[PDB]
Symmetry: D2
Subunit: 390 residues, 4 copies
């Protein structure tokens, strides 16, 4: 069983309280699903199921994955469900949809992730009531999306654990965060984000606004701007607003069918899916996931690391990214070539569906036979997926 | 591939704000995880991945699937995620774990669902700031759990729609409710729930308490007690609190491995998952969900409906319950043999693993060979699984 | 000018989240206004102004004093206002009422206080908009009621400051606390709170409840009960939940008019206001306020301490009550004869009027000619009033 | 007994979330207390009591009046309290101050009001808990300040009710509004608010800002810009954002003492308090309050309406201001000569002292012998004060 990605589409990544400040995630998910179908000329009524990862659904209504699907006119017959591997959420959904087809329980899947971090509420358990005293209204975005459940600290503190263990400096992490801005701003001028991006219409009261640009890419980054920042996590630390990724909005997807099914419908696929994998690492050093998780995908497929021609390794942080870059020892010239999540941004639940899209469209453009996407996960996991263009 | 349910367990079901009014889901989760590990004779350190369905995770923190696994003594090298097909979730995860093994990506999965509706917070988007005027604190249990996202009313109003369609009188709905309470009260006194129930110790400042008994079952439910209430959703309707299920907290799971992997180890499985299916219908009549699902399941197993010896079909509402039974035509004596959710309760994400456990253990207890699990789903779906005893 | 208290009344004092847990303060106030009218034989039409002290009106709506008056049927042509000198309020309002009549601006005043500490809300300033992370919902009872504005600590910490300066042992404070409970119980049992209490009907869906007993008074309070408690404010402190007053709900009032006005109407008044005073003291030892205030009241009356026949000195804390009695040196057997606030409760803005009602109705029953009510006040003040029988 | 206002002062009136956006009301009051002292040449040590009207003190901590007085160096031996008669507050506190001196209980009183509508929190009663279903976080500014407690509608609705009863057109309201702005602008440019205003230093982190101008006053207000607004309260209405006052922050105060005392000190007082009055009306038409209150004040003074040389009548709403002027029939050319609240702003509990400050300083400037200040009050009341020059 060979399961292909016939099409792929992603919204631009927005900035926290930015383009998509008041846009429910499922609206963004609605546009990517319509966009994969439109691109593959498959009608929404041919879609068996919609699998969207999502970390931050509080307030958004029953099963926002279904809410996306219905708004893109996937009929009532089809099915939709969410899931959560935090930041591996959006790429694991592609694996799960891939698995729906190899097991012969669905014919055509649309799988990705969606994320409105801007729209995440504050919350508090108030059923028993609060007999007396102050309490905290909690930011679900931070609590459910960015804080470890086991130690109680921010994910910036787990990338910092990788900065002392691998001895990565404050200079070296500025040289990756600037080099991801530089690579990404080049990309954006060059139009290389055009193909993958499907524009989204933010419906306003005094005028619509079509968003087709990733707005968290700061233009023309020097080094002295990065190296004059103040650590956001430790107070004698090395991770900062500039070498860590952002908080973002965004949705992203891929359209799945068997390889036989694409070629019947006259569809030249972006890739085949050849393997994946998911492993666990010490939570304290959660950024290291992409290492064992790339290894096991690369073993399953039957590929080495030197084989690879193109790689996305989500830059949740600059500490974690460099560490996965070092241990695996692959050519860093082919890694995050149109930049990564520092510059682009990091919409948690969508982000793995993002870097899958960037790789598949850049793989097409440049002529790379073998790609790899990978994402470190909070709690200490890694996830990966080896691709092969036809 | 031929996967088998080696072991299974669940907590008792808690009343709304009752025994587990302050117990986080993942705590209830860890207890059921430890349970199936110990019941199969597999050590936590052999588990590859934990899949928990869960509908209402806001405030609990990062990926409660990982929190339940790590607490239960599963080692950091394994992985963990959750998902949301609403009331279908807890059975869906078992099917999702079956595909990991079938696809050659996991040896051994723990799969089920967990839900604390007690612990679901209220919430509000408060980033913009509220310059003036009231804003709503939104009950996430009601918003994300029980409210249709397209039609804007409760699930119980969809039960009015199904009742109106199927011409199911109030007197009929109350007679299904009282039976389901009478079956469950009978099964409680007779220890038919003891096997599957694993006690949960609620730790407290002032005394540990062991919960080993479903507390939502009302003893000696009479036809008058059901017939004295008012309609809860429609002011000239039929659906009341007596003939719908409640708001509850619990968890439930199953350790899945290939059939061969069980034999090596001397485990006597509680079932082979022969076939599974999920179908979509109109959100207005979401209770009809089980109908196309149970029929597609049966088609995938190559079974006729008259081949089943046992059925658990989830009792969200006595209106939809009566109707699903009416269509499929199976003997109602082999349906919810030990009562259903009206009596036992309806902890949403957990329900699908809840009824599966119930089916598995009565399937063992009476020597039934063929069994089917099914659940209706908000926003217009159903899910279903055949189990066959070894 | 010679001003009399023609009539007085109070609700029973409710326990925190007890009998009045969901009764707005103005509803309690409305019953006492109606009662002082009924007791004097004065019609609501004849009232000029209602003045009600109240510390925690947040969320009750515009000017709760006007709500209470309107509810009691005081005509729209009268006026009403609220005021806040913390625990002084309910007494200070009476003096303020006296001054309307003494300056010829009113003939007929209803004055006192009202408080629902149970109904006091949690709050936060949210107009700016909170960009990110967690914020504090503030208990307005604690913040606006019980915390010193200059030093940041609870009123109980000022009770420790007084326990330290006056060298007041834990066992001395406990014996006082116990004696307060035992004298309150004896008075309650003997019917001594009957004349002052007007019953309050708590209107309830499933039945109305008449509350006519002070429910905070513990029956059979033992010295061992007090002795076993942990210090509530300082870990090597002496002040506990037992030897401090509680958090409580109630209202109390007095109907005033000139002595010649009472004479024409043939009313036998409860008392003439001979004098009153308010003084400040250091916030840190706020419980000492009654010292300077009572001395100043007595000076203004032309009375010696030895001339008093009965005293209500409010029992915020055993520590401060003991300091006060020690310094003034009045005969302790004439002070809080029927118990005090440790036993009865401390509904802040209402307590001044509460202990005036107690003073006035014991004065009448025992035939005492000369009386004095006094209270300490948060932020460092006291208030005192001298009453003589006609 | 003759009471004089020896001195007076006010902060500039701040725009809602404008200059004083994060300044607690007691900090504004502390600056005005300091200023009346300095302007009278009276030391803070000689103050007996501070009395500050305030409607919205939730979350500011214990008795903000005491907080203001202490910050101003008023010694701990003095006393301070707050009161609430809504927009009547800041004036009635002055009459209450007078009465303290008039009955021989104090020699020296600072009295007025302070309000921060910007700092007023949102709130909710959460003590019992919220077992299920949505609940509102209530804007305390709207709930406690601006909503009628009997009818449940905003004060702007009482204004409409007055517009309809007095048959006041939109065009007439708009005219009056534009006249208020144009007159306030003129008075501001010409320096007429300089004497009354004390500057307030907003303490910053990146620099202090000195505020000494009333920032709500729109410069170059056009009739067109009033006329184009949509009714704010009634969709076929008349009352708009433009012909209503605003939501504002500010404080104001007067230092009082006897006339014989000011003579001893050699103070030339701003005025003698000759009479005051407060009267109730129907809540539905509360804007009319000033009518019977001014009449009652004039009758107490022994004055005819035509004896007045200057008047401040608060402009809560153009509709009610116009009705007041119609029924009383005083020359509109002597009313709100420097504009009113539509232009200047309406910090509720501070406004009655705000307009007293404007009457007094204009009375001084023009040599006007007889004045009157009056306000309407939510819930159906009025307050008025007569002032004579010495
Ligand atoms: C503001 C002003 O201007 C004027 C003033 O006068 S300042 C005074 C204002 N009022 C105050 O400061 C209130 C003082 N009291 C308090 O703050 C609170 O009651 C407190 C903090 C001291 C207690 O906190 P709490 O969490 O509500 O505990 P609470 O339930 O009341 O009692 C604690 C325990 O002691 C027990 N207890 C209470 N009173 C007791 C007594 N008299 N004897 C024996 N046991 C007692 C209770 O049963 C409870 O036992 P359990 O936990 O096993 O059930
Ligand atoms: C409590 C008591 O006892 C006594 C009393 O007297 S009650 C009186 C107390 N106060 C009140 O009742 C408050 C009355 N006012 C309000 O509640 C509010 O200001 C209001 C509801 C009327 C308006 O509030 P809002 O929703 O924020 O609208 P707001 O932004 O202030 O104004 C809307 C428009 O009016 C316009 N506006 C107002 N005056 C204008 C003028 N002179 N020229 C041009 N435009 C003007 C603004 O330009 C604004 O346009 P934008 O949308 O482009 O910004």
């Amino acid at each position: 069983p060979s399961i292909v990605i016939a099409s792929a589409a992603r919204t631009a990544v927005g900035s926290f309280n930015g383009a998509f400040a008041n846009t429910p995630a499922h609206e963004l998910g609605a546009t990517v699903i319509s966009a994969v179908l439109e691109r593959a000329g498959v009608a929404a009524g041919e879609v068996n199921e919609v699998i969207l990862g999502q970390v931050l659904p509080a307030g958004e209504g029953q099963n926002p994955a279904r809410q996306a699907a219905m708004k893109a006119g996937v009929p009532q017959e089809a099915t939709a469900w969410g899931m959560n591997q935090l930041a591996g959420s959006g790429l694991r959904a592609v694996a799960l949809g891939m698995q729906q087809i190899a097991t012969g329980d669905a014919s055509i899947i649309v799988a990705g992730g969606m994320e409105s971090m801007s729209m995440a509420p504050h919350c508090a358990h108030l059923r028993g009531g609060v007999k007396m005293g102050d309490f905290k209204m909690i930011d679900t975005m931070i609590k459910d999306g960015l804080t470890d459940a086991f130690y109680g600290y921010h994910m910036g503190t787990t990338a910092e654990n990788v900065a002392k263990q691998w001895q990565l400096s404050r200079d070296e992490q500025d040289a990756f965060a600037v080099a991801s801005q530089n690579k990404a701003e080049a990309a954006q001028k060059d139009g290389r984000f055009k193909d993958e991006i499907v524009p989204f219409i933010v419906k306003g009261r005094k005028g619509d606004i079509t968003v087709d640009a990733d707005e968290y890419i700061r233009h023309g980054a020097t080094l002295d701007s990065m190296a004059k920042l103040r650590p956001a996590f430790d107070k004698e630390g090395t991770v900062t607003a500039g070498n860590a990724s952002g908080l973002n909005d965004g949705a992203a997807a891929a359209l799945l069918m068997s390889e036989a099914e694409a070629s019947r419908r006259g569809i030249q696929p972006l890739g085949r899916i050849v393997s994946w994998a998911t492993v666990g690492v010490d939570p304290k050093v959660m950024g290291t996931g992409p290492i064992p998780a790339s290894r096991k995908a690369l073993e399953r497929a039957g590929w080495k690391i030197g084989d690879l021609d193109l790689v996305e390794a989500n830059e949740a942080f600059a500490a974690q990214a460099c560490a996965v870059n070092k241990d695996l020892g692959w050519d860093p010239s082919i890694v995050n070539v149109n930049g990564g999540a520092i510059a682009i941004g990091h919409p948690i639940g969508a982000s793995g569906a993002r870097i899958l899209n960037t790789l598949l469209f850049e793989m097409k453009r440049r002529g790379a036979r073998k790609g790899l996407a990978t994402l470190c996960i909070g709690g200490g996991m890694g996830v990966a997926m080896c691709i092969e263009s036809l």
